[PDB]
Amino acid sequence: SWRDAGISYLRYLSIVTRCIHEVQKEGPLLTKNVRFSTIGWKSLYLDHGATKEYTAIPAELEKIPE
Amino acid sequence: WDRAQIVYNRYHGAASQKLAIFNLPKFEDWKQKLEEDSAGDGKIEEDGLLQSLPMKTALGELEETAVEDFYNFHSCLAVLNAVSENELSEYAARIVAVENQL
Amino acid sequence: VAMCFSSYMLAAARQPNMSAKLLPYCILGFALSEALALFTLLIALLELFVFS
Amino acid sequence: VAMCFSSYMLAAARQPNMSAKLLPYCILGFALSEALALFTLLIALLELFVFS
Amino acid sequence: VAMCFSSYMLAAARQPNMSAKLLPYCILGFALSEALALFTLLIALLELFVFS
Amino acid sequence: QDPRKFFPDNGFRFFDGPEDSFGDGNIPAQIILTLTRQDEFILKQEPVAAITIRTNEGEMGVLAGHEYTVQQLAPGILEVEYEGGKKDQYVISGGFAHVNDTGVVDINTVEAVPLEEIDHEKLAKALEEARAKSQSPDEAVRIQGEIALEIFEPLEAALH
């Protein structure tokens, strides 16, 4: 199953939440809940002077951290 | 890590945005504290604290993977509350620190 | 007989603070579970040293 | 016999407050199981001290 | 007999630090459960080397 | 140097959790049910007669003075019955449910939406999408099909 695949229980709940937000009806509630599933954030770490993306843990849920 | 001190801003009101922290123990440390406190009699060791002996028994009944998820889940909610309180405090302190600029 | 102490162990693990309240209902269930064996044993010991 | 107490322990663990209200049921079940045992024992004692 | 140690195992695996306070109620069920065996074993050995 | 100008509060304190008493009296007649999604609640300590939950072990029922127990919620639906004989059903995404011996049920979930806000029409299309993902041999997509099916199958069976 998905357990030994390497993903966390929390990514699992978020996948379920994404699906629920899909199937539900169009309205103000959906307008609220699509926000609670959309991915827009990032991560950054500071080089000697510059910014660089810490891409060791992705935001998308299908992938696996390594 | 052994202890994670989350730090954030607490929106007490539109005019007061103080600090607030969550002192999270480690899972391998928290499970041992769970068993140690679940054995002895349940006496609150600090004023304003809630007794939790029945919980640390019942969690002992719960399986291994599920208690791992218990810790990770409740810690996730702690994190999320910190982020939410700081968003409201950001937008509550900006109006103050902007009207003074005006 | 050992079922009683077995239950006491699992119950004490469930709630050690209750461990004191349970042992009266353990020893009671213990001896009077042992007692029948005595009532069963006594017969075979009463069966021989008096009967011809 | 112990199967009665073995429940009352676990029950008393899972809810200490109801330990007093499940007590009569436990006593009753123990007594009735013991009554069956007693009738068998009565046959054993009655089989000898009256019969030739 | 093995029921008692099985209870001790699952009780300690339920509560490790309780493992010390459960062992006193583990040996008591061990001997007295074994004790009946002795008496049950006694008769058969007492049945032969003394009776003709 | 100033000795520790700051003294931040422990943010846990602002909450008012239960005081689990072992009970020296009788049980209430109705459970005080509190249900929470991500941060905002939907129900704050409302009187409720009974509640039925879905779990990995299976489906459970909760009444006043139910035994103190905690376990995972499996992603599905939830049924709540108020004292007036009415009912209210909520789709969830996992979580943990804590039932106090005093009769105070605290439920924490990642999502909570009634059944009324879902249509079988839009649900139907996602099913074969999840099935195609499940049948498509790939560890990254197979699990997604399986999981979306896990939440859709109780909905497909509950609407019907």
Q: Does A10 touch chain B (CB under 8 A)?
A: yes
- The rounded distance, in Å, linking the Cα atoms of F144 and F130 is 7
Q: Is F126 exposed, middle or buried (0-12, 13-18, 19+ CB in 10 A)?
A: middle
The verdict on a CB contact (< 8 Å) between E18 and B60 is no
- Amino acid in the structure at residue B25: P
Strands (DSSP E) contained in chain A are 45-46, 51-52
- The rounded distance, in Å, linking the Cα atoms of B38 and C14 is 9
Instruction: Tell me the domain boundaries of chain D.
Output: 1-52
Q: At what angle do helices C2-14 and E2-14 cross, to 10 degrees?
A: 0
In DSSP notation, E27-48 reads HHHHHHHHHHHHHHHHHHHHTT
Resolution (A): 3.0
Query: CA dihedral defined by C4, C5, C6, C10, rounded to 10 degrees?
Result: 110
Q: What is the 3-state secondary structure (H, E, C) of D1-52?
A: CHHHHHHHHHHHHHCCHHHCCCHHHHHHHHHHHHHHHHHHHHHHHHCCCCCC
Euclidean distance between the first and the last CA atom of chain C, given in angstroms as a whole number: 34
- Give the count of Cβ contacts less than 8 A between chain C and E: 63
Sheet holding F87-92, edge to edge: F59-62, F50-54, F77-81, F87-92, F112-114
Q: Is D40 exposed, middle or buried (0-12, 13-18, 19+ CB in 10 A)?
A: exposed
- Is residue F110 within 8 Å of residue A17, measured between CB atoms? yes
- From the CA atom positions of chain A, what is the Rg in Å? 16
CB-nearest partner of D2 from C1, C11, C22: C1
**What is each CA distance from A35 to A28, A31, B17, in whole angstroms?**
12, 7, 26
Q: Which of D4, D5, D15, D51 to mutate to test the interface with C (most CBs of C within 10 A)?
A: D5
Q: Count the Cβ atoms, other than its own, within 10 Å of residue C24.
A: 9
Is the C-alpha dihedral spanning A18, A20, A25, A28 positive or negative? Answer: negative
- The rounded distance, in Å, linking the Cα atoms of F84 and D26 is 36
- The rounded distance, in Å, linking the Cα atoms of B67 and B56 is 11
Helix (H) or strand (E) holding F91: strand F87-92
The answer for residues whose C-beta is within 8 angstroms of residue F113's C-beta and 6 or more apart is A20, A24, A29, A33, F90, F91
Residue of chain C whose Cα is closest to the Cα of B60: C14
Q: Is E19 exposed, middle or buried (0-12, 13-18, 19+ CB in 10 A)?
A: middle
Give the closest residue to E22 by CA, choosing from E1, E7, E2: E7
- Is residue F147 within 8 Å of residue A19, measured between CB atoms? yes
Q: How far is CA A45 from the centre of its chain?
A: 19
Does domain D1-52 fall into CATH 1.20.20.10? yes
Structure-determination technique? cryo-EM
Q: Count the Cβ atoms, other than its own, within 10 Å of residue F82.
A: 16
- Is residue A16 within 8 Å of residue A63, measured between CB atoms? no
Helix (H) or strand (E) holding B95: helix B64-99
Phi, psi (rounded to 5 degrees) for C50: -120, -40
DSSP, res F73:
B
Euclidean distance between the first and the last CA atom of chain F, given in angstroms as a whole number: 70
**What is each CA distance from B39 to A12, C19, C36, E5, in whole angstroms?**
34, 11, 35, 20
Q: Give chain F's count of helices (H) and strands (E).
A: 2, 11
The answer for residues whose C-beta is within 8 angstroms of residue B38's C-beta and 6 or more apart is B53, B56, B57, B60, C16, E15
